[PDB]
Structures are given as C-alpha cells and as structure tokens.
Amino acid sequence: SKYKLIMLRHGEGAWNKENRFCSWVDQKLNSEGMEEARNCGKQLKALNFEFDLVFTSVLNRSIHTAWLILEELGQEWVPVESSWRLNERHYGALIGLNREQMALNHGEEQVRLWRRSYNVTPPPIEESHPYYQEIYNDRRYKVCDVPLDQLPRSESLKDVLERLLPYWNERIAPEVLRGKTILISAHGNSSRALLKHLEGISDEDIINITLPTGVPILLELDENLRAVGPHQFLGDQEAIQAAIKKVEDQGKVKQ
Amino acid sequence: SKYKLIMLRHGEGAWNKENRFCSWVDQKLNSEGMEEARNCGKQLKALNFEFDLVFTSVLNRSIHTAWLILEELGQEWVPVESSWRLNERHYGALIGLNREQMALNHGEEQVRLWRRSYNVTPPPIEESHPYYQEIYNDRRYKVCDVPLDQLPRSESLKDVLERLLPYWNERIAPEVLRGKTILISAHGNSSRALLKHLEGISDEDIINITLPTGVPILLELDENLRAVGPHQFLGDQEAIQAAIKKVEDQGKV
C-alpha cells in the first residue's frame, strides 16, 4: 500500500565550510562530516532500520557517508550500488567559486536563480578551469553508461532530473515496489531533483526548497510511487531549520 | 599470464592478540588490522591496480578491509559484492578457544592438524556454545542462497571449498574471463581453499600453506583459469615470511 524510504545529503566538507561550490569535485568528508554520517546511522539504528539496498553517487563523499551509516547499523553486508546519475548537480564554471563573492559580483537574485531555480543553467566548465582535469580524467567517468565526452559540463536542476529520473524509475523504484527498505546517500541538489519529482513540486516552488546537510530525510510513497505527504526531517527541528537558514545565507551579502 | 587476480586475508582483530579462533564470529578489525588494510591499498596503488569489481564475505572485517583498500586507491566507486560463500572456515565448537592453550593441552601437532588439515571437520557448534546465538540470529544469514538451517555448523577445509567453489564458478570466474581486474577480500582458510583449487594443490600439500594477514596475493591465470605458477605475495618477502611464521607460532607453546 504505502512505502517509506530514507534519503539524505552527506555532511559538509572543507569547501562548503568556506562557502565554495563543490559539485563534481571529488572532495572527501572532513572530521565533522564523518561524525554527521555516524549520527545519522545512530538515528536510523534507534528506529531499528534494516536496509536491504543502498544507492549512492560515484562521488566518494556520498559513498563514505553510506559506509559509515552501515557500520553504525552493523549492516556493512547490505548491497551498495553507486551511479553518476545520483551525482550532485554539475555547477560548471561556478565550481570552486565562493557563493558570497558571486552574490557581491552578480547580486543575490541571480545567485538564488543559479542555486535554486529549475531551468537556469550554470555556464559550462571549460578545459581551462582549475578543476576540469581532475574531474574528467577519473576512470569512474570512463565506465559510465554514457561516454566521457557525453557527460555534462554544467546542469540546471531540470538537467539533473532528466538524468536522475531514469535511474530512479529503472533501478530504485522497482525495489521500493518490492517492499525493500532503501537508503539513498546523495547530495543537496540531486536530492532536491528527486523530491521535486516524487512530491510533484512545481517548477516555481522548488526554488524555495533547501535541504540541510547530514540529516535523514523521511519520505512515504503510495502505490503509484508519489509522495503521500511532504518530506520530513529527522532530528531537532530548530537545529534543522537553523541549518537550512545557514545554507540559504551562504548566498547572501553580509548584514 | 592471460589474466591476473588479487586476493587477500584481512588484518588482525581483537582475538588475534588473544589468540582465539574467531571464524564466523563477526569480530571487527582493530586499529592495527585497519592499518594493515591501508598498507595493502598503498601497495596495490604502487603497482597501478585498477579494480573493476570486488568480492568479500559477509563478515564485516573483510568488507571494511575492501573499503579501506578502495579508499587508499581512490576507487570507492568500484562495485562490491558480498557472499557467505567467502566466509572464513567455520570452526564449530572450537570458536572462542585459545589456540596456544589447546596446543598445551592436546599437543602442537594436534592443533596443527585441526588448523590446516584438508579433511578434518571440527566438532559442530551447538546452541549451548557461547557464540551460537550471536552468529545464527543475524539477518545476513536469513537472506543467503540457502536456508538458515542449511548453513554449516562446522567445516573442514574440504567443506569450505565445496561451498565456495559454486560462487567462484558462477560469479567470480565469469568476470575474470571477461578481462575484469578482480579483488577478493576474504579470510585465512577460505583463501587457502580457493588457492588449492586454482593452483591444483594436493590434499597433502595444502596443509603446509599458511597465509599472512593483510598481504596482497597475486595470482596469474591462463585461459582455463588455472594458475600459471605459485601465488605471489606482493611485498618484502622477509617481512612476509615472518608474518607467516607469526600465524604458525600461534599454535606453538
């Protein structure tokens, strides 16, 4: 009849702490991010979750987050599957740049569009970009279901959904319909893309949805795999709203 | 050789210092065992290994070993598959017992026979055993390819090969033939079992094979997946030989 699953975005690493777009740059979790993953695992253990399958992106921070959660649950044996289709949205040329600096240079309105709009596309990352090489030279992108030269160089949230939706429908959703307990260790925007779809959020309303880092996201789906109600956050609601505000404030100018 | 494959047994756990038979008890790696895994990954990175698939058992120490290896390699994205068929030999009633104590009581030769014989089956573990419940009540064994009551309660090395061979033939071997570079993160005796098979080691000769912890083992196979030479421990042979002696000495008074 109804099905519940868990999705979340990993804890913040070095870059996001200093307010820089990370996106496809394969940055590892820091001490704080690791602890955040362990805390999510402890929460899920308290709820006595017994996962059957775990899905992650190919960015190591989402994989490590999943590994830490499984360790906390004593479920390291549970199958894990990783796909670039769950990768964080590709911020193109904006990768590595400071969000507040962009707000000062282009205005808060434009930054909000780049960050949260559905259709706005970031300028494409070019070969001259400081982080182009370490991204596209990695073997993980040489064995994807799409050619290396075919992978995106930037993505709007709509682009993300277009490449993520097929993975959800074809590899995750079937497991949900089989009654399996699933965990999705993803990122801020790839998660927003999935939620927009599952909750039927309008192209206009999705711009106001911001997800806090390191917080289990609860979602219940119906027989048609559509949300029964809006997504919920597991934990201290005040700390969670404060965390959401922090993320929103990274795109704003001081005082 | 036509194909190359890497297999290894994980680093130490708490019962290594205590020198007790761990077997199916899901003990975690200790600080040293984790470092052993990191050193394996660094050694594999130094040799440019790029894995396409990783196989482990369902005992967490072998999984964490694979994870630590992949991290050192920057290959955390490589698919991992786990199976009880790769689990360490089931020591039955001997689980939890101190090896040196048994050697003192029954003789080093007796303990050596129980540890390395290909045919001797240890006494089955009974419900009254101190670690029976901690083993058979785990969900991981409720979802394997055979019923919970079908799982072994003790195994000779021969029994191990018999339940491991099907997995090798069905899941691992095909991937190797496809040209994929495979990493098998297993245990001391389940690894000896696979080596016996791949190298065509006799029932008598397998007794003399003891594997060191946390050392990558390179196996080169031909078109028929038969070893084209004895296994090769990757690293300093002197340190490796001392590591082998360490494992042997666990059974000496």
Ligand SMILES: [NH3+]C1CCCCC1
């Ligand atoms: N990142 C933190 C957000 C508030 C709950 C604990 C994790």
